[PDB]
Amino acid sequence: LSGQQQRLLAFFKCCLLTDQLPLAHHLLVVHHGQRQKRKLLTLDMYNAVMLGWARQGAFKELVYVLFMVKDAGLTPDLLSYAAALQCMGRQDQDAGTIERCLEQMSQEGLKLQALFTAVLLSEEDRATVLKAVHKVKPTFSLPPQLPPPVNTSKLLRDVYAKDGRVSYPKLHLPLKTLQCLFEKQLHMELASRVCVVSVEKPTLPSKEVKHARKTLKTLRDQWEKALCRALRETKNRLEREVYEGRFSLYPFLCLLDEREVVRMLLQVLQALPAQGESFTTLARELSARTFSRHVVQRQRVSGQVQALQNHYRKYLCLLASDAEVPEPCLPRQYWEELGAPEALREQPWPLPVQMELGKLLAEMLVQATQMPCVPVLYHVYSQQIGILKPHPAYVQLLEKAAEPTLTFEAVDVPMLCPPLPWTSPHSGAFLLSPTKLMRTVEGATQHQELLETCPPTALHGALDALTQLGNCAWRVNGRVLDLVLQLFQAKGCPQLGVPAPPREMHSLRAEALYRLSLAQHLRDRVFWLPHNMDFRGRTYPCPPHFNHLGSDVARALLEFAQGRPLGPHGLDWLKIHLVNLTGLKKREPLRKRLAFAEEVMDDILDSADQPLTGRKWWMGAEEPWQTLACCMEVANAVRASDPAAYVSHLPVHQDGSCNGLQHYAALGRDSVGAASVNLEPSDVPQDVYSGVAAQVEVFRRQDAQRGMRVAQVLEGFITRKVVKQTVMTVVYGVTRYGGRLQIEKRLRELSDFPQEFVWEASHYLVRQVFKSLQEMFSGTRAIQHWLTESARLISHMGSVVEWVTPLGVPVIQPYRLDKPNTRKQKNGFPPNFIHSLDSSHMMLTALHCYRKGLTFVSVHDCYWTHAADVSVMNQVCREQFVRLHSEPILQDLSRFLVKRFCSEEASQLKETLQAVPKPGAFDLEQVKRSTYFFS
DSSP states (O other): OHHHHHHHHHHHHHHHHOOOHHHHHHHHHHHHHHHHHHHHHHHHHHHHHHHHHHHHTTTHHHHHHHHHHHHHTOOOOOOHHHHHHHHHHHHHHHHHHHHHHHHHHHHHHOOOOHHHHSSOHHHOOOOOOHHHHSSSSSSOOOOOOOOOOOOOOOOHHHTTTTTTOOOOOOBEEEEEHHHHHHHHHHHHHHHHHEEOOOOOOOOOOOOHHHHHHHHHHHHHHHHHHHHHHHHHHHHHHHHHHHHSSOOOOOHHHHHHHHHHHHHHHHOOOOOOOHSOOOOOHHHHHHHHHHHHHHHHHHHHHHHHHHHHHHHHHHHHHHBSSSSOOSSOHHHHHHHHHHHHOOTTTTTTTOHHHHHHHHHHHHHHHHHHHHHHBBBBBBOOOOOOEEEEEEEHHHHHHHHTOOOOOEEEETHHHHSSSSSBSSSSSSSSBBBOOOOOOOSSSTTTHHHHHHHHSSSSHHHHHHHHHHHHHSEEEEEEEEHHHHHHHHHHSOOOOOTTTOOOOOOHHHHHHHHHHHHHHHHHHSSSSOOOOOEEEEEOOOEEESOOSSOOTOOOOHHHHESSSSOOOOOTTHHHHHHHHHHHHHTTTSSSSSSHHHHHHHHHHHHHHHHHHHTSSSOOOHHSSSSSHHHHHHHHHHHHHHHOOTTTTTTTSSSSSEOOHHHHHHHHHHTTHHHHHHHTTTSSSSSSSHHHHOOOOOOOHHHHHHHHHHSOOOOHHHHTTTEEEHHHHHHHHHHOOOOOOHHHHHHHHHHHHHHOSSTTHHHHHHHHHHHHHHHHHHOHHHHHHHHHHHHHHHHHHHHHHHHOOEEOOOSSSEEEEEOOOOOOOOHHHHHHHHHHHHHHHHHHHHHHHHHHHOOOOOOEETTTTEEOOHHHHHHHHHHHHHHHHHHHHHHHHHHHHHHIIIIIIIIOOOOHHHHHHHHHHOOOOOTTHHHHHGGGGGO
16 A cells, blocks of 8 residues: 555554544544545554444444445445444443344345454454344354464474374473563563673772763753653644644654653663664664563553463473473464464554654654763764764763663563464564564565465474574573683783773674673573574574674573483583584594594693683684683583583584585585585595685686786685685675675784785685685586576566475565665575575474474574484484485475466576476485584
């Protein structure tokens, strides 16, 4: 529909939420009076007004709205009849009148049960309509609810099998403890903000520091008063707009309390960084915050929070180890079994309306806040986007004040209770604040629409994997946190990665400070990280400030709260993991790595006991913090009389190093590719990156002979690690220069390499690595060319490439040329497709591990799990990979693309799709037999 219509409809719905039925009715009447405005008006808007009048009990007003719809010439739909019935139920209308309305429903050819099923309504509304029917002669005759559907796909068939071989893991914490944790999370959700003491050591305040704190407090109070005044003036103007009939944001402002809006704007000023944040981004954030605090308020007033409490305690019983449930069920399945109490307000406001509201809030903040060196926030264009910059004096005042209180959004902090089961894409993660399956802002609406179009069962398999990831419990390690605290307080170490005290150094310090503060806050408290999916389908943790993927130090800090005994092989797995973290003997086999671990055991023990004053071998290792944490675990295990008896909280990371290349070589079944990426079983693992480096070296020597001097500049500086980063950029990308920037960063890290030609060197490395990868792998070269040419052809048609993963979740590329960008779509599709396959293999592995009872989480390529679980999870990854590639993914992709776009350039696309790469000699089953496929 029209953009104006979208906002008018949003205004009416918001008025229903605010209970401003007269204002909405008045605006509707004004629009009806003008013929052009009446054309803008839609039946759904009238239905919404009727619903609100049917929640008030004013039948006469509802009838007047019906008269207006008749004057417009629209015909009353099922929703209008629904509202009439519910109003009659509320007001105890005479049975004969209800019967007359029912006759009019049959006059429009509409069954009452069918109309109720077709049009969604609040349960109070449904109860009212049902009572109306019960007053009338007709019986309610409610149809029984259908049992929840399950996936028929062969890959997920084993997961959904009804045979009672399932042994789902149960959380160690008792049920009562889980309920208390839920209560803490609930209180946090109601407040919507978390105050955390600053990690940085607080010096005794000086006289000047105290004065700065007083000045800041006075300024904050002055800003609060100004903000309240500005909000009131804007509300009055918007109410006048409501009388005029122009679209107004007055209900949107009304939904959140005036004090809450002011408190939110003030916290936004405190949260905003010294460099500043984009004005458009800030406006979007403000609108999202308002919607969140309003959904929480609406649930509280409705009573949806109490019903949720009860329903959730029942769900908690399944998770709790002490409580026993006779039939094991998947968490979403169990939730659905208890019922569906999800709020109907989970759906958000239209994006243009949200943008308008956010911009209004940002403008109010800028005008209201003034401080003497005038306004705190300065709007300056940059790319070429307006940004809001904090006052320089304000930043200095903040530094001088050194306030220990840090505010964080409820969404920003990890949950204190298990995440809500993902029964639907829209409703997941935080119980009170709805989390949308698509974490990524870009392409979220299109992807969400695709998800709704996709059958629920296919969504269900991914939803189960996400729920399982959320259910995993994370506890911060005390020892690592303490060491990081000591270094962070006093300068820190660049090699360790602790940021130096506060161009980007200040930002890094602030981000680290927030992450450490969250870690300290949750150090003694078990917490659950919800997982959200991007467009590619990769799973990411929802909280931005604290997540394992974000930083190496965070990876060291985070360890499983649930504890599983090492077992006979657990100690060996810990040693192998430690060697992997160091990066020593990567090419050598696992047996050699274990022998090396025995050789370096003395260093391991010394480093664990005294990290700061020890040999500091862990610092030498490529991942210092992770190495130190592993060293501590190994030391504890040896100290314990039995290593098998000892329980290792710390995760053991198993990775294929090049998951995308492994998928490319499996798809083409290339023998050379399988050997290079370790798909083929071998006594000694062969490093793909080393082979790429060799091929790069031969190309480098050819270029040195040639006039181009880039090779000479890079001669002797193409280290294996840098090559590894370049290979990852080529295989995995969103067609962005940022990955190339990472290659540049690796080149910058080498002091000997000149930075004068670093940009050219990064470009040249990308080209050389791409040539090397294609040359070494015939199957990969073919598949990549086919994908690139298919994506390019689809982009020319003008439709964004859309494909369905083997799991069944549809993946779309969110690139929009200001139309799809041909460059991004053609280059993006091979990496995005490879990512989707990797995520599919990860979800299959996770679900099967869940059936086995292993705790599984995925961080990038690495698959995290307990040391005892590692061997089993390796077997699962080897079987699931084979099963995924057993299905003809290339053929399925070609057929799906043919359906999506060929039946519309399409013929050329059809020919390209038809010419799928032929299967290679290498046997798929070999992957199962390959011990070194993941290591």
